[PDB]
């Protein structure tokens, strides 16, 4: 399981394991990641609207 | 009865459909062969689920009694569109 | 059996300028005329036809003059000008109908072996869709009576074979390409709602004197479509549009932040260009 | 046998017995029993691959009530035995032609389908093409109640 060769959780408090995995989200990783490097790109115009300020 | 609890318990098909429990599933298999009704019925409770169904012939007390139904849904939906539009009222623009 | 045809406004215009015809030669009142079609498949094309000169006595609808030389000889000199568009169908005006549509498309069928005749609409003001098409039917009843040829609603829809609006769409002069959703909505909302008005005051005609059809074939099975949902207790469906409106929010929020980033950052960089760099 | 194409014929497998046994005591044409039941390493091997015919093809039948099925009354509604049914269950799962999921954990599992983990495209399609069905009531319920308006 640590190395994604399984997922799922298995059991000993009750013997019996289970298996799940259903990662891809296209919506929440692609989105917000876009939007954090659209954040990267705002920090950087700070400094185009500081100067052009003074 | 046009409400709810559709996943109905066996217990009124095994009083009044004189059938037994071991039998309900042939009820509803053979009526799956007989294609009216196809419902997806419970079997950890022993449910027999009310799905789509082939509903009657005639009931004119009822196609006269319909509007409980009916002009709820005309007059309803209508104000409930009269409502949506209301409050996106002056977007009109 | 046809689900659509070609509906071409020019056609539309035809009828509408020989409508303009029968009213100003005299007080000839429903519009009747021969529809002329190409079968190319249960699809179909209607763009040319005509209006033919007919007269129906007040009294035994069963009266009409369909002129062989204003359409068989004619047809012959529209033979040498386009063939595709076969004698195909006819139409009259008048809301619901007379006693003898049934008779004529029969006399025509003779001509197209799926004749059609046409509801014509003289004054646009319906709710939806102008005109629509009936081809012969053989649905006379688990009764099965002696065939019966009131012809259904076969249904179609307004084809536009070719754009040609290089002057149509230079008649609009109204419009633009609507990036409308509200007028969507009032438009659906209040026509489904008139639509089931009619429907309770036909059944309760039905109740109170309505004929045997009161229920006849489908009444009850249109009771069953409404059946799909016979509070309808959507609380399955209820907790599926939490996640969707999850989804719904997560677009929503994302999709908007974005744009409030998006408009912030540039339209403040030219308003404090133009502002202080101005003075 | 030509029924049993049909809803599996989920049926007391002793009575197939019968219907198949008592060819063995035909008072006519027999041939076709010894060429079946009259065998013993094969022909008893029938009844057997017929013992797998019954609870694979039931399997295939019944998958449509489930998502709610126990281990206890899967052998009830199978005419075959419980552990009868846990080596059914076994044999048919790791074929796995079908994709069910089961577990001990509560024995209460079946022959499913996918278990529907499935987003929005479940409610899609039941919004979309229920509310179409719906414009098309609409639709013909112009028409057709003024066809039974023509009369009047």
Same mark, same amino acid.
């Given at each position: 399981i640590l190395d994604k060769k399984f997922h799922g959780i298995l059991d000993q408090g009750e013997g019996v394991l289970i298996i799940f995995d259903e990662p891809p989200v296209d919506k929440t990783y692609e989105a917000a990641l876009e939007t954090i490097q659209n954040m990267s790109k705002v920090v950087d115009s700070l400094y185009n609207k500081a100067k052009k300020l003074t | 009865r046009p409400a709810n609890h559709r996943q109905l318990t066996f217990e009124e098909i095994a009083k009044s459909a004189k059938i037994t429990v071991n039998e309900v599933e042939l009820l509803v298999m053979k009526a799956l062969s007989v294609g009216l009704v196809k419902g997806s019925i419970?079997?950890?409770?022993?449910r027999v689920h009310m799905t789509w169904v082939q509903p009657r012939v005639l009931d004119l007390q009822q196609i006269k009694g319909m509007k409980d139904r009916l002009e709820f849904w005309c007059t309803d939906v209508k104000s409930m569109e009269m409502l949506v539009e209301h409050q996106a009222h002056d977007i009109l623009t | 059996a046809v689900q659509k045809v070609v509906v071409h406004p020019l056609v539309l215009l035809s009828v509408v300028d020989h409508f303009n015809r029968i009213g100003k030669v005299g007080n000839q009142k429903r519009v009747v005329g021969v529809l002329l079609g190409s079968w190319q498949k249960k699809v179909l094309d209607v763009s040319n036809s005509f209006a033919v000169p007919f007269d129906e006595d007040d /009294?035994?609808? +069963?009266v009409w003059f369909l002129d062989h030389d204003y359409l068989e000889n004619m047809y012959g000199m529209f033979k040498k000008v386009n063939?595709?568009?076969?004698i195909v169908g006819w139409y009259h005006t008048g809301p619901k109908l007379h006693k003898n549509d049934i008779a004529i498309n029969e006399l025509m069928k003779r001509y197209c072996p799926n004749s059609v005749l046409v509801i014509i609409?003289? /004054?646009? /003001?319906?709710?939806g869709l102008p005109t629509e098409a009936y081809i012969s039917v053989?649905?006379?009843?688990?009764?099965?009576?002696?065939? +019966?040829?009131?012809?259904?609603?076969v249904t179609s829809e307004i084809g536009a074979?070719?754009?040609?609006?290089?002057?149509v769409e230079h008649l609009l002069r109204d419009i633009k390409d609507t990036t409308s959703q509200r007028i969507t909505n009032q438009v659906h909302g209040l026509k489904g709602l008139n639509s089931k008005l009619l429907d309770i005051r036909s059944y309760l005609e039905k109740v109170?004197?309505?004929?045997?059809?009161?229920?006849?074939?489908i009444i009850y099975q249109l009771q069953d479509v409404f059946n799909?949902?016979?509070?309808?207790?959507?609380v399955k469906a209820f907790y599926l549009k939490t996640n969707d409106q999850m989804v719904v929010v997560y677009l929503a929020s994302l999709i908007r932040s974005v744009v409030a980033l998006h408009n912030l950052i540039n339209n403040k960089i030219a308003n404090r260009d133009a502002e202080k760099k101005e003075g | 046998l030509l029924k049993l194409f049909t809803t599996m014929e989920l049926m007391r497998w002793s009575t197939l017995v019968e219907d198949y046994g008592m060819?063995? $005591?035909?008072?006519?044409?027999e041939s076709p029993a010894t060429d079946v039941?009259?065998?013993?390493?094969?022909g008893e091997k029938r009844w057997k691959d017929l013992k797998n015919r019954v609870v694979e093809h039931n399997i295939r039948i019944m998958?449509?009530?489930?998502?709610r099925i126990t281990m206890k009354r899967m052998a009830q509604l199978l005419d075959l035995s419980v552990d009868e049914s846990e080596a059914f269950l076994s044999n048919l799962v790791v074929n796995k032609t079908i994709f069910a999921k089961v577990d001990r954990?509560?024995?209460?599992?079946?022959?499913? $389908?996918?278990?529907?983990?499935?987003?929005?495209l479940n409610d899609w399609s039941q919004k979309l093409n229920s509310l179409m069905s719906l414009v098309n009531k609409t639709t013909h319920l112009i028409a057709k109640e003024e066809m039974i308006h023509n009369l009047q």
């Open positions: - | 419970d079997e950890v409770d022993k | /009294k035994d609808d +069963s063939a595709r568009e076969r609409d003289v /004054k646009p /003001k319906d709710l053989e649905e006379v009843h688990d009764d099965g009576t002696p065939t +019966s040829k009131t012809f259904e609603h074979e070719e754009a040609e609006e290089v002057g109170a004197t309505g004929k045997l059809p009161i229920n006849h074939q799909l949902l016979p509070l309808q207790e959507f | 060819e063995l $005591r035909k008072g006519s044409l039941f009259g065998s013993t390493e094969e998958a449509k009530y489930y998502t954990l509560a024995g209460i599992i079946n022959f499913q $389908r996918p278990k529907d983990p499935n987003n929005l």
